[PDB]
């Protein structure tokens, strides 16, 4: 008989909002699939990584600056849950491109 109440904070983080939200709400609803106690998907301010460059390979030409931007999106969900259901929530809900991390943490 395993099973004991562990506090958990699983954080999802990636750049593809559709799949990130996919696995996010999938997680919250598949974890609320059985009346589990939680603090659902908290949204962290979207991170915008910029790169400001010259379009030209050389020097000549009008000074046309090109601006690139990649977007980091980080959700964190808190679950109060035993031991089996966690390994069960970590084995499945895997997404190619979505970085998932599972922390115990309680002090």
């Amino acid at each position: 008989q395993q099973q004991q109440i562990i506090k958990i904070r699983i954080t999802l983080t990636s750049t593809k909002v559709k799949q990130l939200e996919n696995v996010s709400s999938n997680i919250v609803k598949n974890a609320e699939q059985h009346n589990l106690v939680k603090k659902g998907p908290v949204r962290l301010p979207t991170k915008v990584l910029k790169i400001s460059t010259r379009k030209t390979p050389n020097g000549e030409g009008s000074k046309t600056w090109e601006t690139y931007e990649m977007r980091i999106h980080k959700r964190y969900i808190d679950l109060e849950a035993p031991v089996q259901i966690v390994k069960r929530i970590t084995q499945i809900t895997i997404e190619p491109g979505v970085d998932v991390e599972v922390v115990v943490a309680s002090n």
Partner: protein, 223 residues
């Protein structure tokens, strides 16, 4: 580890770039067409999409071994922390890179620029593609440089549907005389799409009504 997820995502990206590069160089003769990296428990899965997976596999799994060992050794991974699969690409004539390397390998066989290009675009159209255009830039047999556009079908060039529909490859075919630039463009059919906006932000389709037979004073019907 113990990184800032900024640097983690960035590093992930650079990892991908170096990956697609190396595979591109290493698997040209096998019609390679892209990869994807998958972070999983136990192992990390590189997935190849060449056209010749029967040879990419190699003599009973010897060459995929050579390449897995390669990648492992380089990026510092513990023997088993990485695995490379090689599953064929559906419709080789819809990913630009494939047709790019195709025509390149056509002109390494000395076939008529017109013949190679027109055959390429013909194949691409025949593979159920909305449109396709192959630009061929450079110096060729003559002295002063020249270029040749080869389009057929439907393409758009402007807006967000750029990112959504058309594929643009640029491959540098290198010959004895100089070098040529094979630009390949494929507009894949919106109606298909499977995942993502399945019609151009233009396409506003009206649905056709039907004849109604009025007349004959009201009445009712009791159920």
């Amino acid at each position: 580890a113990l990184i800032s997820k900024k640097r983690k995502l960035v590093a992930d990206g650079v990892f991908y770039a170096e990956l697609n590069e190396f595979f591109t160089r290493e698997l040209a003769e096998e019609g390679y067409s892209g990869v994807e990296v998958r972070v999983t428990p136990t192992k990390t899965e590189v997935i190849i999409r060449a056209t010749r997976t029967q040879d990419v596999l190699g003599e009973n799994g010897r060459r995929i071994n050579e390449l897995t060992l390669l990648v492992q050794k380089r990026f510092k991974y513990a023997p088993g922390t990485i695995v490379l699969y090689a599953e064929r690409v559906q419709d080789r004539g819809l990913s630009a890179v494939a047709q790019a390397e195709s025509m390149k390998f056509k002109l390494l066989n000395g076939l008529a620029i017109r013949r190679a290009a027109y055959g390429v675009v013909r194949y691409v159209m025949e593979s159920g593609a909305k449109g396709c255009e192959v630009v061929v830039s450079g110096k060729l047999r003559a002295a002063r440089a020249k270029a040749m556009k080869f389009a057929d079908g439907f393409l758009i060039h402007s807006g967000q549907p750029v990112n959504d529909f058309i594929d643009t490859a640029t491959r540098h075919v290198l010959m004895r005389q100089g070098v040529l630039g094979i630009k390949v463009k494929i507009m894949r059919d919106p109606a298909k799409s499977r995942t993502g906006p399945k019609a151009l932000p233009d396409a506003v389709t009206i649905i056709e009504p039907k004849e109604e037979e009025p007349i004959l004073a009201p009445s009712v019907k009791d159920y």
